Design a protein around this ligand. Structure first.
Ligand SMILES: *Cc1c(COP(=O)(O)O)cnc(C)c1O
Ligand SMILES: *Cc1c(COP(=O)(O)O)cnc(C)c1O
Lengths: 366, 366
């Protein structure tokens, strides 16, 4: 018989426009990384790499996680994947049996529920409130815990809210994982795009319960390179490598060598990060002041490069709001898929010039 | 609770040695491809690409499948993946429900049964015979079809046997798919590594039943670049792209542009293919001559760069034979995992000098 599988069928799908929809940096990847790619090419590093990644990168990864995040991990508790998205996908395929529950915090990144469902898992949503700065209340999270809870996904700095969760909240969530015996999945890819506060990694207190996901995509403007990395309990990392072996085999070898340079040349990478960070902060401040002057509401973000804007004054719902803004000349992302109803996601990974235009057009819509 | 999933737990795991174990070309990727990669880097083509691949590549793919294989496909019935392995992985995830049966022809590439079972499928094995040159008998296949058959996997040129199936057998297999209504998965990555006969794509006789899987890996010495491609029914291709979107997002952008060059610069690419084909042919003959002189049995391959050697004269079984050979100084791959019992896979993707060195050491295990 022909026909698609159930898992795949259950899956969810001359005008001048100013686009504020980007999910990737506007900067190009820094030259030290590009140069390392060039050396790898000339050195013929074009062969298959091990499923978990070239050993040199795994070693550098163990250093980064300990040095930057205070995580006590060995090279064997580290894995290189085809983007942070594959680290999350392999993780769910490795820990979820049909019916296992995963607590997700809304608004959430679009891919989380999809990946959980694709593995046969059940999504259990816990909402974070705009009035609480989109920071989870551990008390609301406890109520979502059942005997079937397998994992809890935390994403700070957050996409799409831009919220940075305080260490006390993160410690409280790590404690629930330990007390109730489940995995804490910490998506930390925006760690370096932080304007205020500190980036705390829950793996610092509960390493055997925490799976830390990260990558080069957002920090080093390497979205198209497809290199992500994770660390955590040795047995889970081993299982994740098994999934890669039977799907992608291993990430692009040239990209792995280029990523090694981003991690080892701390001086050049630090210079890129500080430059981008300062640019993003100026853009964020520019946007927020403008929105406030218009009377539009948005919780001030402390990280990433997104702003969730309440659309109540523009239309009855976020899709109608998004279509009106489109007519006005501004492309925004409706909050529907992120479970951010009544909001629209704005991205400031564009020029100040474009942010000014967009504010002019919002003005006209009001 | 914590713990690994069943699908992951069910998964199967001073000496001078000459290695005849390679599953990739010894040649480095051609300069024109490397140059295309440098241009993309210089041009800032480092951003996210669409889930099915950059439009330029999907169009070049349509041309390739039409031109080289006589397949009539549009760019939309084309998909780019992270290696041909991901094409197969996404395919099974997109077409298999737990319990669905997939017919595989032994000896088979190690990854087929693992990919089938990971998606919940049941592996039904149909044996090909040494006496029949490892070419399948359509009758034996017919005898394996049940109401639960979802697909039949065919790989020609074959890994690990090196057999090239005649157009007439490929047509008979396609007909069974059309006759019994199931998918025909054609793994054609070794099409350009052919020494005698001609490559026939069964998608020509059963377009709506066939998924043609291919890639740049073996033909252009690009195993580490991780770029594969497939074509087939629009609805299946669309479903495969959906799997990519929630797992890898899209293959590395730099590698996609480099692959476009390998497909469009026909003059430089054919020069490489013909150069490699010539070298492989030399190495094959040399290896076969040597074995024959040693009194060792092996079926003469017409494609790829492998030879399945009968280990009867060496040890009771192929694992023991592989161990004796190791002591003798030659590393070979036991036929165990390919369901090629009593055999050992030899790869001639190495220099003639190494092949000569191995043949010399073979004298010690008689
Ligand atoms: C970008 C992103 C990732 C991973 O991106 P990759 O490009 O696959 O590395 C993971 N989580 C969030 C919230 C992201 O925004
Ligand atoms: C090498 C190979 C593939 C695909 O390899 P990729 O490196 O993932 O492109 C598929 N089938 C067979 C039989 C192979 O030998």
């Amino acid at each position: 018989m022909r026909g698609l599988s159930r898992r795949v069928q259950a899956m969810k799908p001359g005008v001048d426009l100013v686009a504020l929809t980007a999910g990737e940096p506007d900067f190009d990847t820094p030259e030290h990384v590009k140069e390392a790619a060039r050396r790898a090419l000339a050195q013929g590093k074009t062969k298959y790499a091990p499923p978990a990644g070239i050993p040199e990168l795994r070693e550098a990864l163990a250093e980064k996680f300990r040095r930057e995040n205070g995580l006590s991990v060995t090279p064997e508790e580290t894995i290189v994947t085809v983007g942070g998205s594959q680290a999350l996908f392999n993780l769910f395929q490795a820990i979820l049996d049909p019916g296992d529950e995963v607590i997700v915090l809304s608004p959430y990144w679009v891919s989380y529920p999809e990946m959980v469902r694709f593995a046969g898992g059940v999504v259990v949503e816990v909402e974070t409130l705009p009035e609480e700065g989109f920071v989870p209340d551990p008390e609301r999270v406890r109520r979502a815990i059942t005997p079937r809870t397998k994992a809890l996904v935390v994403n700070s700095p957050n996409n799409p809210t831009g919220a940075v969760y305080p260490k006390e909240v993160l410690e409280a969530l790590a404690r629930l994982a330990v007390e109730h015996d489940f995995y804490l999945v910490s998506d930390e890819i925006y760690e370096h795009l932080l304007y205020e506060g500190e980036h705390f990694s829950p793996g610092r207190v509960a390493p055997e319960h925490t799976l830390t996901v990260n990558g080069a995509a957002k920090a080093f403007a390497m979205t198209g390179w497809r290199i992500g990395y994770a660390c955590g309990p040795k047995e889970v990392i081993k299982a994740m490598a098994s999934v890669s072996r039977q799907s992608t085999t291993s990430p692009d070898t040239i990209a792995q060598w280029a990523t090694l340079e981003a991690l080892t040349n701390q001086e050049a990478s630090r210079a890129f990060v500080e430059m981008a960070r300062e640019a993003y902060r100026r853009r964020r401040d520019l946007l927020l002041e403008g929105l406030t002057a218009l009377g539009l509401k948005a919780v001030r973000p402390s990280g990433a490069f997104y702003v969730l804007m309440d659309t109540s004054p523009i239309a009855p719902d976020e899709v109608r709001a998004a279509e009106r803004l489109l007519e006005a000349g501004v492309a925004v992302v409706p909050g529907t898929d992120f479970a951010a109803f009544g909001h629209v996601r704005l991205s400031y990974a564009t020029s100040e010039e474009n942010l000014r235009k967009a504010l002019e057009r919002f003005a006209r819509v009001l």
